[PDB]
Amino acid sequence: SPVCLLCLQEPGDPEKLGEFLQKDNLCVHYFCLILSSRLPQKGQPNRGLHGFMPEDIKREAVRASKKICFVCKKKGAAIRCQNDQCVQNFHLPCGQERGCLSQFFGEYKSYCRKHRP
Residue 103 CB, nearest approach to Zn ion (Å)? 14
CA atoms of 9 and 20, how far apart (whole Å): 10
Residue 81 CB, nearest approach to Zn ion (Å)? 3
If the CB atoms of residues 25 and 44 are measured against Zn ion, the closer one turns out to be 25
Binding site for Zn ion (CB under 5 A): 4, 6-7, 29, 32, 69, 71-72, 81, 83, 86, 88, 91, 94, 112, 115
Count of Cβ atoms closer than 10 Å to residue 99 Cβ:
11
81 is in an annotated binding site: yes
CA atoms of 21 and 19, how far apart (whole Å): 6
CA atoms of 61 and 58, how far apart (whole Å): 5
27 is in an annotated binding site: no
Residue 117 CB, nearest approach to Zn ion (Å)? 11
Q: How far is CA 72 from CA 81, 90, 103, 110, 114, in A?
A: 16, 8, 22, 17, 18
50 is in an annotated binding site: no
Binding-site residue numbers are: 4, 7, 29, 32, 69, 72, 81, 86, 91, 94, 112, 115
